[PDB]
Amino acid sequence: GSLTEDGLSYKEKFVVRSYEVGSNKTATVETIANLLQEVGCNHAQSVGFSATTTTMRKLHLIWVTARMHIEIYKYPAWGDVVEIETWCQSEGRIGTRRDWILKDSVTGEVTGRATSKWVMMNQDTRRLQKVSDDVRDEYLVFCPQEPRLAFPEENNRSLKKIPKLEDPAQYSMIGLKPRRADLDMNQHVNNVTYIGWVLESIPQEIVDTHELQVITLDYRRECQQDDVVDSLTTTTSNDSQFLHLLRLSGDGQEINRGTTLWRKK
Amino acid sequence: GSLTEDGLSYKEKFVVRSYEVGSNKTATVETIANLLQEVGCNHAQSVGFSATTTTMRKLHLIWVTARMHIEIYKYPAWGDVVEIETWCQSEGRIGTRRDWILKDSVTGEVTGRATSKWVMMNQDTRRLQKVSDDVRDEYLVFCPQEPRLAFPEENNRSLKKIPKLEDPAQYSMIGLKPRRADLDMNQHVNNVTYIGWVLESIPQEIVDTHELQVITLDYRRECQQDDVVDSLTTTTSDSQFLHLLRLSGDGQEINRGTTLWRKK
Ligand SMILES: COC(=O)c1cccc(NS(C)(=O)=O)c1
């Protein structure tokens, strides 16, 4: 892992592991989403962070994931080397964006790409707020000035509105709880666990005959360690599409909503 | 990753990741148990395996974990490089053994060690075999001839009998189910998930004040993807615990073990 020549992006190589692959001997979307988080942490570490800035630590402010969009063309096989390139960008007072390009090391061909929107939140009160000017200057020196998009297209599927799943759901996975492996160093549930929870409602037949091409996720609430979750799914559609919804088992408080696109293997 | 000079052991270096560490900024025992499995897979791959031998493929025979014993002295911190060395050994017609030595790359100091016993089983049915002579010759060319033990000590912790937890348990974690991330490429539940399930019954106070030094696990049954598990724990004492994993319904035993925790 190292920053590029300009110092405005970061590149890292990963060798895919035996326990990281699914039934097709290729990496899982959660392994990819874990690898994207790792290269993002190493990019923040390489530029002097611990991605809280000096003003964010002083004000008890943190960056939380508002949205995650991943598109995979080829899943790296067990033993393959996957090069991931990541970079950050400001989106005015709304928040920040982090993009990724996944490539095969051998061929140099783009095998995937991801984009994520992050919102500013007070760590203690959980109150979202706009980005102040003092914080925007602290990270503008590590971001490209001109716009660099992983999903540039005028009608890209990364900025699409997601509706709320109506009851009854076609498919469901009830009683999902996080374990200590699902928590980060600060004891909050890892963002990758919600993705794995969304896909639990998808039937095994769809997984055994299709491959996940696109996954968009909107994060609305934080799941505590002692919380219980319900994954809900309804087909909205060669290609199969789904509407997803994660909610607490009790009250049904919405924690997540998203869409998945699957293609025939 | 590469085999040593003699070709009878395998060494690999791992850089610890952000998502692999716990609340103490050091690797978790499950991350270590995952890393041990990875270096074992790479050791088997480096010597021509798909650790199934040629006569094992034709007979529909696989190696299953009967026991796992891990002892950690220092958990590698986030960003640290951990060198793991692994090797296999035959234990006559009883089965095979795989050992590991964990070291810090910078200092070269031993930060942990592990040992595991594996039994031969028919993949189709669940009948444990006693290892034939045709299989012994196929893997004796990749094993040291003289005994090389990670836990050599006469009458040590790794070969201790484990009793069955009596009801009522002091602590419990009920309704544990595996997700698709908890399964391997063959759709069976990863053996690391049972370790994570054993530790779910341990109270958060013990985790926040102690560090897991030793973990011994005896595997009795496989957990299917559609099965529901119950983790049970009782303090037997440094703090020691007696653990038991069983199916939610009938209470069929799937696992039993013991843990040792030192004050941070
Ligand atoms: C716009 O974001 C929110 O409303 C929000 C609120 C709470 C949490 C999150 N994200 S997460 C990764 O902690 O689940 C987003």
Ligand SMILES: COC(=O)c1cccc(NS(C)(=O)=O)c1
């Ligand atoms: C002696 O071992 C057994 O009886 C046995 C039976 C079934 C399974 C296992 N282990 S595992 C890792 O496949 O869950 C051991």
